RNA sequence: GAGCUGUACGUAAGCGUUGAUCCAGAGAUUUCCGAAUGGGGGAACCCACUAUCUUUAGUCGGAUAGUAUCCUUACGUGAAUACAUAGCGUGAGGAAGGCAGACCCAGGGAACUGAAACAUCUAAGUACCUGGAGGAAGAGAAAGAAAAAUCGAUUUCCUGAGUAGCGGCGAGCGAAACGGAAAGAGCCCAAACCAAGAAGCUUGCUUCUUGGGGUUGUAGGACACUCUAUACGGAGUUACAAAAGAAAGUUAUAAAUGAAGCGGUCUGGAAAGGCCCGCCAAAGACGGUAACAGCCCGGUAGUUGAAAUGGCUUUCCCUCCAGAGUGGAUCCUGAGUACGACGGAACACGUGAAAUUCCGUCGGAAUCCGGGAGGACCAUCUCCCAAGGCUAAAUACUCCCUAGUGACCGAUAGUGAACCAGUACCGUGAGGGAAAGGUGAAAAGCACCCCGGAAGGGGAGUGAAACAGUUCCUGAAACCGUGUGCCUACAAGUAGUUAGAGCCCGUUAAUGGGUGAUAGCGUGCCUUUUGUAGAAUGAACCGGCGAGUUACGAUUUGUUGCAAGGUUAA
RNA sequence: GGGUAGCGGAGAAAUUCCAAUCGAACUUGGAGAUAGCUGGUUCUCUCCGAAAUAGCUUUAGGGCUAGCCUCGAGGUAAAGA
RNA sequence: AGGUUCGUGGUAGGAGAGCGUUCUAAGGGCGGUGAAGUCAGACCGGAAGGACUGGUGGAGCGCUUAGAAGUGAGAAUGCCGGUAUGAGUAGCGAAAGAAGGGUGAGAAUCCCUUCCACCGAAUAUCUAAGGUUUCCUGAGGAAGGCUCGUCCGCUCAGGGUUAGUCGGGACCUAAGCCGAGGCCGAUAGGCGUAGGCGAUGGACAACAGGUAGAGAUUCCUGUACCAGUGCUAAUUGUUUAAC
RNA sequence: UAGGAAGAGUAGUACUGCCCGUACCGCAAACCGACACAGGUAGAUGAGGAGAGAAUCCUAAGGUGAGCGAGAGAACUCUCGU
RNA sequence: ACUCGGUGAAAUUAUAGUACCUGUGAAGAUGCAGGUUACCCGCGACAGGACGGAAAGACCCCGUGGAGCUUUACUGCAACC
């Protein structure tokens, strides 16, 4: 996908529009991403070996990758991304600031 | 280029930037059955022999290779029977089986039906069975079509034309040439003769093989002489002879890059929608994203990319090559053949005045001073040269792969099959053959409390919605219930309609709505009938599905264009 | 455990049996056989409106021509009642 | 456009004008401030039909002018699905049960005890065929069981079948079947010799006990037999030739 | 007997002996009959009294009480007795 | 069979508030006419009617329907001479 695990994310649409977060996991097969502090759900969980006490656990849920834009590490605004092969590696390039995100 | 160990959750254990999972090309491995092939067999099983090796103290056990049948061929052995043949053995090559329910060539070959009966005829050389194929097959370079003049190998399409004809002259069947197009390409033998060899001895001869020569109708060739030519030139694996090897280019099979809004605000669970502003465009295809996106994502136009393998096209290499003329002694030019009789079949043509082609059986020519055809046949003329073979393209079809399209279907439709479908199920078997799609944007799939053994509920919670709670979008009718306003236990009812009190309501507001004591009138619907309430037929009820269409011809009416003209087909 | 298969087989003979099927088995195909016969054929209104007869017919509950209906167009030395 | 006159029952049937459904094209629109569909109303048109308002629903659909049709159902002993009536009706598939304890949420129906009854050339015990896990143990009670069920040939999870001698093959053949060469025949194939398959028959070596969840001539304990092999110890034979 | 043949038997010891079936039902609720169906299904064994007997009646070993019940005791129908 | 507890079908069915007599009518009426009877809802019984249910009458006729059989019907074919 265009967004990797460990990246910084600005949420572009949805109920959490305007918020920012970090990628905790990526699901390219189904095209979803898990982002910290974003799209919290409440699960009614019975007591089990995992989660010994159970209850109403408040955790995170995936959102679609199209509702996401990368944050420039310096300019700090959502940018579309380009790809430039610099040296022996192809790196991602911010298309507003014209600089290398990686 | 960052996650991964499928559907498929989960647990467990692990692996990946020292670059995994994944995608494409090329390799290796590939149990048993099945043509099944060492022998057998009731499918996926059973039992071996011969060589070489291995284990054990030795039987017992293990590994590898070979071992079917027929055809062709080489060698060897070898009977009645003397030579020899048959037979037997070994080796080397080849075949066998399947299918794409299509297309085409051949062998065999119906009936129902139509003729308003039926036998000739039709259906129909169709269905079907069997055998051969090929990517196409078949046909194909005139013993042709023709007719005051010519054409010049096949095939397919348009016309000719529902014409000429055939026909219990009934029902019906039904051409071809000329003319216009698509596509186009021509060639090898046999025989006269030459050279060599071999067998018989046909005993100095014929007859067998090999090589050269040569293939045609104005007749051509052999044969005689002239001219040139042995690679100067020409041709080629699609016929014309056949097998290889290189290089360049292109294409197919993975991919890379790729412009422009997080614009403000309203509603909302969520904006891609409304209103107000911008921008890109060789890119406003398509799909996704919480509602309808050129500017969010995958992408799109444009421009690039191939280690490996395949295809195609050029060039090289390689390979193979006599062709003109003038003569007319002698020689050659496809024999049990062409034809004829008899019996059949194919020709549009049913025996007919029946040409032309093929099959079975009998008879049976000429050979250049020769032979065939021109729809009986003769004469004249004209055209042609059989009884040997090969040949691309234009034509037919689609099990497949790639890219797309539709005034095609939308879950009783469209394939039988949108779902683990030729499945479940039925049948001894061949065979027949279903039903069955939809939670939500996201499992956030209801912690906890209460009644109950559970199932199932009532709260609480999630969500925009739970009257979306794991047959879950919507949720009609039949059918089953609970509650209630008006009527009903002296009445004879196709159940309504017209008149009409009383009681109860209050509308799309108008000479309004529900129910109805009592009074008049009144024998369902359909089909089929001279005539049906009919004791004639059909329907338990509700829902879905369910019957004059299309192609090509004819005729008539309307409309439009042109008009003694109108109009093109392929 | 085996053999005989439908233009066939078996029959101490009854048209008897050949997988609950037999004056000619079952299955698939020709095949949507053919049916001058019975049943069915789906929205509305406006104008007109029959026949159940003659002739021939392997004809008689079928057909064909005429007679009777409907739509359109014509011509008069007006022909109809 | 307006008059005048004459008309306006209708089956088979002829002629005309229209309504509604799906799709296409152009124009012009509606719609999360709620589309289609569905429900209910006392509205409009000459008919087929068409609006308006409210509930449910939760994403698409009208209008105009043309065009094209899988074009409109009440009947076919029509096809498929759903649901009634008969009706709490017929039936519940040959037979002897009773009580006391137990288990359990729950007992005529499950377990135990006692008494009674039935079969007994069988309704007892083996074993071929056929079936194919139905067998044992632990859990279970939605559906199946013509009632009930705590039970089960039912559901779930784990188990369970031991052979030199038993039955079959590695042994034999009958009927019948296949069949190298061969004979016959439009094709396909039919018949048949050598050879080979094929038991329902012939030949062939093991008995008695024990085994408390499920196997027994198979496992175990005692005592055997059949066929072979090596190793020891004696005997004997060698090409007028042991065997 | 034709043939093959220098090894052979004897006694004792110890070792070797493959593949397939094997559960369970089997006059039956497990097989053939669409069913937990009054039908059908080869063979071996099959006790006592009385008896010719495998007839008949009552019993042994062994196996069963049959997958809807209780209570009333009308017509009528069925199977029985006088 | 009947009453009680458990379980629980089917053929059939245009909608039904479903009397009798004499008549009428497609000529034999629960439903039409004129009269005569008759409070509402069931349970156990019996079969006169609903031309009761079941099976598109096997008899009879018709169709230019079919099939099996016969012969000195017609036309053929095998086989044999
Ligand atoms: Mg392997
Ligand atoms: Mg085989
Ligand atoms: Mg074999
Ligand atoms: Mg085996
Ligand atoms: Mg060995
Ligand atoms: Mg030889
Ligand atoms: Mg000799
Ligand atoms: Mg082949
Ligand atoms: Mg082929
Ligand atoms: Mg014929
Ligand atoms: Mg013909
Ligand atoms: Mg013909
Ligand atoms: Mg074939
Ligand atoms: Mg090929
Ligand atoms: Mg071609
Ligand atoms: Mg060819
Ligand atoms: Mg030519
Ligand atoms: Mg020629
Ligand atoms: Mg020429
Ligand atoms: Mg063409
Ligand atoms: Mg030559
Ligand atoms: Mg010459
Ligand atoms: Mg914004
Ligand atoms: Mg909001
Ligand atoms: Mg917007
Ligand atoms: Mg585009
Ligand atoms: Mg789009
Ligand atoms: Mg944008
Ligand atoms: Mg000659
Ligand atoms: Mg002639
Ligand atoms: Mg002739
Ligand atoms: Mg001619
Ligand atoms: Mg000629
Ligand atoms: Mg050829
Ligand atoms: Mg639906
Ligand atoms: Mg869903
Ligand atoms: Mg969804
Ligand atoms: Mg409780
Ligand atoms: Mg609960
Ligand atoms: Mg709802
Ligand atoms: Mg809903
Ligand atoms: Mg409802
Ligand atoms: Mg309803
Ligand atoms: Mg009431
Ligand atoms: Mg009175
Ligand atoms: Mg009133
Ligand atoms: Mg009153
Ligand atoms: Mg009649
Ligand atoms: Mg109905
Ligand atoms: Mg027959
Ligand atoms: Mg008899
Ligand atoms: Mg009979
Ligand atoms: Mg009209
Ligand atoms: Mg409508
Ligand atoms: Mg529009
Ligand atoms: Mg509606
Ligand atoms: Mg409605
Ligand atoms: Mg309504
Ligand atoms: Mg709603
Ligand atoms: Mg049209
Ligand atoms: Mg249509
Ligand atoms: Mg339709
Ligand atoms: Mg109707
Ligand atoms: Mg029908
Ligand atoms: Mg029906
Ligand atoms: Mg249904
Ligand atoms: Mg039905
Ligand atoms: Mg019912
Ligand atoms: Mg008791
Ligand atoms: Mg089972
Ligand atoms: Mg049950
Ligand atoms: Mg019951
Ligand atoms: Mg219990
Ligand atoms: Mg069990
Ligand atoms: Mg044995
Ligand atoms: Mg053997
Ligand atoms: Mg023995
Ligand atoms: Mg020994
Ligand atoms: Mg073995
Ligand atoms: Mg074994
Ligand atoms: Mg037993
Ligand atoms: Mg006696
Ligand atoms: Mg007795
Ligand atoms: Mg006893
Ligand atoms: Mg009761
Ligand atoms: Mg009862
Ligand atoms: Mg009366
Ligand atoms: Mg009553
Ligand atoms: Mg007639
Ligand atoms: Mg008959």
PDB file of C-alpha atoms (C1' of nucleotides) in Angstrom, chain D residues 7-199:
ATOM      1  C1'   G D   7     -79.503   7.883 -34.759  1.00  0.00           C
ATOM      2  C1'   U D   8     -76.590   5.337 -30.103  1.00  0.00           C
ATOM      3  C1'   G D   9     -79.572  -3.662 -27.395  1.00  0.00           C
ATOM      4  C1'   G D  10     -76.157  -7.072 -29.305  1.00  0.00           C
ATOM      5  C1'   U D  11     -73.041 -13.168 -29.976  1.00  0.00           C
ATOM      6  C1'   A D  12     -69.462 -14.945 -34.195  1.00  0.00           C
ATOM      7  C1'   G D  13     -67.086 -11.034 -36.825  1.00  0.00           C
ATOM      8  C1'   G D  14     -65.152  -6.168 -39.454  1.00  0.00           C
ATOM      9  C1'   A D  15     -63.453  -0.916 -38.522  1.00  0.00           C
ATOM     10  C1'   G D  16     -61.536   3.158 -35.176  1.00  0.00           C
ATOM     11  C1'   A D  17     -59.445   5.657 -30.835  1.00  0.00           C
ATOM     12  C1'   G D  18     -56.880   4.959 -26.568  1.00  0.00           C
ATOM     13  C1'   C D  19     -54.918   3.178 -21.201  1.00  0.00           C
ATOM     14  C1'   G D  20     -51.002   0.772 -18.593  1.00  0.00           C
ATOM     15  C1'   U D  21     -45.921  -2.298 -18.241  1.00  0.00           C
ATOM     16  C1'   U D  22     -40.033  -3.022 -19.356  1.00  0.00           C
ATOM     17  C1'   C D  23     -35.987  -0.926 -22.172  1.00  0.00           C
ATOM     18  C1'   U D  24     -33.279   3.009 -25.583  1.00  0.00           C
ATOM     19  C1'   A D  25     -32.143   8.488 -27.395  1.00  0.00           C
ATOM     20  C1'   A D  26     -32.512  13.597 -26.582  1.00  0.00           C
ATOM     21  C1'   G D  27     -34.460  17.429 -23.609  1.00  0.00           C
ATOM     22  C1'   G D  28     -35.891  18.968 -18.805  1.00  0.00           C
ATOM     23  C1'   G D  29     -36.299  17.383 -13.530  1.00  0.00           C
ATOM     24  C1'   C D  30     -36.911  14.906  -8.425  1.00  0.00           C
ATOM     25  C1'   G D  31     -34.302  12.575  -4.333  1.00  0.00           C
ATOM     26  C1'   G D  32     -30.845  11.048   3.074  1.00  0.00           C
ATOM     27  C1'   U D  33     -34.554  18.107   4.655  1.00  0.00           C
ATOM     28  C1'   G D  34     -35.789  10.659   2.455  1.00  0.00           C
ATOM     29  C1'   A D  35     -36.131   7.031  -4.097  1.00  0.00           C
ATOM     30  C1'   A D  36     -38.506   2.582  -5.543  1.00  0.00           C
ATOM     31  C1'   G D  37     -41.542  -0.867  -3.119  1.00  0.00           C
ATOM     32  C1'   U D  38     -45.414  -1.717   0.767  1.00  0.00           C
ATOM     33  C1'   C D  39     -49.927  -0.089   4.022  1.00  0.00           C
ATOM     34  C1'   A D  40     -54.362   3.286   4.771  1.00  0.00           C
ATOM     35  C1'   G D  41     -57.784   7.137   3.285  1.00  0.00           C
ATOM     36  C1'   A D  42     -64.513  10.258   2.623  1.00  0.00           C
ATOM     37  C1'   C D  43     -59.803  12.832  -4.126  1.00  0.00           C
ATOM     38  C1'   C D  44     -59.741  13.202  -9.932  1.00  0.00           C
ATOM     39  C1'   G D  45     -61.040  11.276 -15.295  1.00  0.00           C
ATOM     40  C1'   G D  46     -66.221   8.626 -19.925  1.00  0.00           C
ATOM     41  C1'   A D  47     -63.294   3.502 -19.350  1.00  0.00           C
ATOM     42  C1'   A D  48     -58.571   1.059 -19.189  1.00  0.00           C
ATOM     43  C1'   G D  49     -56.583   4.295 -15.070  1.00  0.00           C
ATOM     44  C1'   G D  50     -54.117   8.900 -12.385  1.00  0.00           C
ATOM     45  C1'   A D  51     -52.806  12.086  -8.260  1.00  0.00           C
ATOM     46  C1'   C D  52     -52.398  14.074  -3.031  1.00  0.00           C
ATOM     47  C1'   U D  53     -51.553  13.227   2.280  1.00  0.00           C
ATOM     48  C1'   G D  54     -49.665  10.303   6.378  1.00  0.00           C
ATOM     49  C1'   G D  55     -47.041   5.468   8.383  1.00  0.00           C
ATOM     50  C1'   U D  56     -43.130   1.835   7.159  1.00  0.00           C
ATOM     51  C1'   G D  57     -38.606   1.611   4.063  1.00  0.00           C
ATOM     52  C1'   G D  58     -33.409   3.085   3.484  1.00  0.00           C
ATOM     53  C1'   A D  59     -31.270   4.196  -2.335  1.00  0.00           C
ATOM     54  C1'   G D  60     -32.472   5.342  -6.518  1.00  0.00           C
ATOM     55  C1'   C D  61     -36.765   7.198  -9.813  1.00  0.00           C
ATOM     56  C1'   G D  62     -40.287  10.109 -12.630  1.00  0.00           C
ATOM     57  C1'   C D  63     -41.969  13.785 -16.778  1.00  0.00           C
ATOM     58  C1'   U D  64     -42.050  15.263 -22.489  1.00  0.00           C
ATOM     59  C1'   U D  65     -41.440  13.761 -27.687  1.00  0.00           C
ATOM     60  C1'   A D  66     -40.089   9.671 -30.350  1.00  0.00           C
ATOM     61  C1'   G D  67     -38.443   4.330 -30.963  1.00  0.00           C
ATOM     62  C1'   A D  68     -38.435  -1.164 -29.854  1.00  0.00           C
ATOM     63  C1'   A D  69     -41.207  -5.413 -27.393  1.00  0.00           C
ATOM     64  C1'   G D  70     -40.220 -12.004 -23.377  1.00  0.00           C
ATOM     65  C1'   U D  71     -46.883  -6.423 -23.293  1.00  0.00           C
ATOM     66  C1'   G D  72     -51.836  -6.880 -19.367  1.00  0.00           C
ATOM     67  C1'   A D  73     -54.557 -13.990 -16.670  1.00  0.00           C
ATOM     68  C1'   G D  74     -59.801 -16.070 -13.174  1.00  0.00           C
ATOM     69  C1'   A D  75     -60.459 -20.703 -15.412  1.00  0.00           C
ATOM     70  C1'   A D  76     -56.022 -25.124 -19.458  1.00  0.00           C
ATOM     71  C1'   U D  77     -58.573 -32.576 -14.073  1.00  0.00           C
ATOM     72  C1'   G D  78     -52.327 -26.090 -16.104  1.00  0.00           C
ATOM     73  C1'   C D  79     -46.523 -26.056 -13.289  1.00  0.00           C
ATOM     74  C1'   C D  80     -44.095 -24.582  -8.653  1.00  0.00           C
ATOM     75  C1'   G D  81     -44.543 -22.634  -3.513  1.00  0.00           C
ATOM     76  C1'   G D  82     -47.365 -21.388   0.839  1.00  0.00           C
ATOM     77  C1'   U D  83     -51.662 -22.174   3.724  1.00  0.00           C
ATOM     78  C1'   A D  84     -56.731 -23.988   4.899  1.00  0.00           C
ATOM     79  C1'   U D  85     -61.411 -27.692   5.392  1.00  0.00           C
ATOM     80  C1'   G D  86     -62.545 -32.492   6.988  1.00  0.00           C
ATOM     81  C1'   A D  87     -60.795 -32.235  13.056  1.00  0.00           C
ATOM     82  C1'   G D  88     -58.674 -32.397  18.128  1.00  0.00           C
ATOM     83  C1'   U D  89     -61.655 -36.582  14.021  1.00  0.00           C
ATOM     84  C1'   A D  90     -59.267 -41.881  11.856  1.00  0.00           C
ATOM     85  C1'   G D  91     -54.935 -44.127  13.659  1.00  0.00           C
ATOM     86  C1'   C D  92     -50.971 -44.970  17.466  1.00  0.00           C
ATOM     87  C1'   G D  93     -48.719 -52.086  13.642  1.00  0.00           C
ATOM     88  C1'   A D  94     -50.789 -59.403  17.010  1.00  0.00           C
ATOM     89  C1'   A D  95     -48.943 -60.445  23.434  1.00  0.00           C
ATOM     90  C1'   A D  96     -49.317 -59.618  31.323  1.00  0.00           C
ATOM     91  C1'   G D  97     -48.167 -57.306  34.532  1.00  0.00           C
ATOM     92  C1'   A D  98     -47.609 -55.460  39.926  1.00  0.00           C
ATOM     93  C1'   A D  99     -45.471 -53.098  44.024  1.00  0.00           C
ATOM     94  C1'   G D 100     -41.147 -51.362  46.827  1.00  0.00           C
ATOM     95  C1'   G D 101     -36.371 -48.786  46.619  1.00  0.00           C
ATOM     96  C1'   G D 102     -32.924 -45.222  43.502  1.00  0.00           C
ATOM     97  C1'   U D 103     -31.676 -41.278  40.122  1.00  0.00           C
ATOM     98  C1'   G D 104     -33.180 -36.750  38.458  1.00  0.00           C
ATOM     99  C1'   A D 105     -35.559 -29.976  37.237  1.00  0.00           C
ATOM    100  C1'   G D 106     -39.079 -33.540  35.795  1.00  0.00           C
ATOM    101  C1'   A D 107     -40.617 -40.818  35.879  1.00  0.00           C
ATOM    102  C1'   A D 108     -46.687 -45.792  33.809  1.00  0.00           C
ATOM    103  C1'   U D 109     -42.140 -45.660  30.213  1.00  0.00           C
ATOM    104  C1'   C D 110     -34.481 -45.359  32.850  1.00  0.00           C
ATOM    105  C1'   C D 111     -31.724 -48.568  36.917  1.00  0.00           C
ATOM    106  C1'   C D 112     -32.132 -52.395  41.094  1.00  0.00           C
ATOM    107  C1'   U D 113     -35.157 -56.092  44.158  1.00  0.00           C
ATOM    108  C1'   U D 114     -39.150 -59.479  44.752  1.00  0.00           C
ATOM    109  C1'   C D 115     -43.589 -61.824  42.982  1.00  0.00           C
ATOM    110  C1'   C D 116     -46.403 -63.058  38.590  1.00  0.00           C
ATOM    111  C1'   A D 117     -46.753 -64.364  33.297  1.00  0.00           C
ATOM    112  C1'   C D 118     -44.883 -66.110  27.824  1.00  0.00           C
ATOM    113  C1'   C D 119     -41.547 -69.282  24.258  1.00  0.00           C
ATOM    114  C1'   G D 120     -38.877 -73.721  24.680  1.00  0.00           C
ATOM    115  C1'   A D 121     -37.541 -78.758  16.748  1.00  0.00           C
ATOM    116  C1'   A D 122     -37.980 -71.938  19.704  1.00  0.00           C
ATOM    117  C1'   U D 123     -39.151 -66.517  20.758  1.00  0.00           C
ATOM    118  C1'   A D 124     -32.555 -70.923  22.719  1.00  0.00           C
ATOM    119  C1'   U D 125     -27.004 -71.579  20.882  1.00  0.00           C
ATOM    120  C1'   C D 126     -23.502 -71.420  16.375  1.00  0.00           C
ATOM    121  C1'   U D 127     -22.601 -69.996  11.469  1.00  0.00           C
ATOM    122  C1'   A D 128     -22.726 -68.566   5.594  1.00  0.00           C
ATOM    123  C1'   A D 129     -24.842 -64.384   2.723  1.00  0.00           C
ATOM    124  C1'   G D 130     -25.915 -59.383   2.999  1.00  0.00           C
ATOM    125  C1'   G D 131     -24.999 -54.651   5.892  1.00  0.00           C
ATOM    126  C1'   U D 132     -20.577 -51.707   6.863  1.00  0.00           C
ATOM    127  C1'   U D 133     -18.699 -49.140  12.709  1.00  0.00           C
ATOM    128  C1'   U D 134     -24.535 -50.180  13.882  1.00  0.00           C
ATOM    129  C1'   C D 135     -19.485 -52.765  18.624  1.00  0.00           C
ATOM    130  C1'   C D 136     -17.080 -50.432  23.906  1.00  0.00           C
ATOM    131  C1'   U D 137     -16.514 -46.179  27.378  1.00  0.00           C
ATOM    132  C1'   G D 138     -17.616 -41.130  28.892  1.00  0.00           C
ATOM    133  C1'   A D 139     -20.819 -37.028  28.125  1.00  0.00           C
ATOM    134  C1'   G D 140     -26.048 -35.247  25.855  1.00  0.00           C
ATOM    135  C1'   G D 141     -31.357 -34.530  25.100  1.00  0.00           C
ATOM    136  C1'   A D 142     -32.786 -29.633  19.703  1.00  0.00           C
ATOM    137  C1'   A D 143     -34.330 -33.226  15.836  1.00  0.00           C
ATOM    138  C1'   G D 144     -35.355 -39.077  15.054  1.00  0.00           C
ATOM    139  C1'   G D 145     -38.218 -42.959  18.433  1.00  0.00           C
ATOM    140  C1'   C D 146     -46.189 -43.305  16.120  1.00  0.00           C
ATOM    141  C1'   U D 147     -46.869 -41.455  23.764  1.00  0.00           C
ATOM    142  C1'   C D 148     -42.943 -40.181  27.581  1.00  0.00           C
ATOM    143  C1'   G D 149     -37.864 -40.396  28.359  1.00  0.00           C
ATOM    144  C1'   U D 150     -33.049 -38.901  32.911  1.00  0.00           C
ATOM    145  C1'   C D 151     -33.054 -43.823  27.923  1.00  0.00           C
ATOM    146  C1'   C D 152     -31.521 -45.580  22.788  1.00  0.00           C
ATOM    147  C1'   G D 153     -29.282 -49.228  16.865  1.00  0.00           C
ATOM    148  C1'   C D 154     -30.056 -41.308  17.881  1.00  0.00           C
ATOM    149  C1'   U D 155     -25.956 -36.686  18.674  1.00  0.00           C
ATOM    150  C1'   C D 156     -20.623 -35.566  20.329  1.00  0.00           C
ATOM    151  C1'   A D 157     -15.488 -37.158  21.778  1.00  0.00           C
ATOM    152  C1'   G D 158     -12.137 -40.975  22.450  1.00  0.00           C
ATOM    153  C1'   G D 159     -11.269 -46.200  21.703  1.00  0.00           C
ATOM    154  C1'   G D 160     -11.701 -51.382  19.850  1.00  0.00           C
ATOM    155  C1'   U D 161     -10.568 -56.480  15.298  1.00  0.00           C
ATOM    156  C1'   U D 162      -3.405 -59.830  16.825  1.00  0.00           C
ATOM    157  C1'   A D 163      -3.072 -66.725  13.157  1.00  0.00           C
ATOM    158  C1'   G D 164       2.914 -71.543  10.019  1.00  0.00           C
ATOM    159  C1'   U D 165      -2.040 -74.968  11.760  1.00  0.00           C
ATOM    160  C1'   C D 166      -9.263 -71.485  11.215  1.00  0.00           C
ATOM    161  C1'   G D 167     -11.684 -69.589   5.841  1.00  0.00           C
ATOM    162  C1'   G D 168      -9.385 -67.721   1.001  1.00  0.00           C
ATOM    163  C1'   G D 169      -4.450 -66.755  -2.186  1.00  0.00           C
ATOM    164  C1'   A D 170       0.693 -68.226  -3.136  1.00  0.00           C
ATOM    165  C1'   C D 171      -2.156 -75.855  -4.845  1.00  0.00           C
ATOM    166  C1'   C D 172      -6.140 -78.538  -8.419  1.00  0.00           C
ATOM    167  C1'   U D 173      -9.899 -78.737 -11.716  1.00  0.00           C
ATOM    168  C1'   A D 174     -16.256 -78.588 -13.403  1.00  0.00           C
ATOM    169  C1'   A D 175     -20.165 -75.740 -15.949  1.00  0.00           C
ATOM    170  C1'   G D 176     -18.982 -71.406 -18.142  1.00  0.00           C
ATOM    171  C1'   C D 177     -15.756 -67.430 -19.874  1.00  0.00           C
ATOM    172  C1'   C D 178     -11.273 -65.338 -22.383  1.00  0.00           C
ATOM    173  C1'   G D 179      -8.382 -66.801 -26.201  1.00  0.00           C
ATOM    174  C1'   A D 180      -1.302 -66.194 -29.822  1.00  0.00           C
ATOM    175  C1'   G D 181      -1.373 -68.107 -34.530  1.00  0.00           C
ATOM    176  C1'   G D 182      -6.030 -69.844 -37.330  1.00  0.00           C
ATOM    177  C1'   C D 183     -11.153 -70.038 -40.052  1.00  0.00           C
ATOM    178  C1'   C D 184     -15.241 -66.741 -41.479  1.00  0.00           C
ATOM    179  C1'   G D 185     -17.286 -61.898 -42.594  1.00  0.00           C
ATOM    180  C1'   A D 186     -19.645 -54.345 -45.968  1.00  0.00           C
ATOM    181  C1'   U D 187     -17.081 -51.911 -41.355  1.00  0.00           C
ATOM    182  C1'   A D 188     -17.741 -53.093 -36.400  1.00  0.00           C
ATOM    183  C1'   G D 189     -16.756 -58.002 -35.587  1.00  0.00           C
ATOM    184  C1'   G D 190     -18.361 -63.780 -34.957  1.00  0.00           C
ATOM    185  C1'   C D 191     -16.292 -68.586 -33.970  1.00  0.00           C
ATOM    186  C1'   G D 192     -12.302 -71.398 -32.335  1.00  0.00           C
ATOM    187  C1'   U D 193      -6.734 -74.518 -31.274  1.00  0.00           C
ATOM    188  C1'   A D 194      -2.493 -74.368 -28.021  1.00  0.00           C
ATOM    189  C1'   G D 195      -2.775 -71.834 -23.450  1.00  0.00           C
ATOM    190  C1'   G D 196      -5.246 -69.671 -19.249  1.00  0.00           C
ATOM    191  C1'   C D 197      -8.997 -68.140 -15.618  1.00  0.00           C
ATOM    192  C1'   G D 198     -13.059 -69.937 -12.849  1.00  0.00           C
ATOM    193  C1'   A D 199     -16.022 -73.350  -6.467  1.00  0.00           C
TER     194        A D 199
END
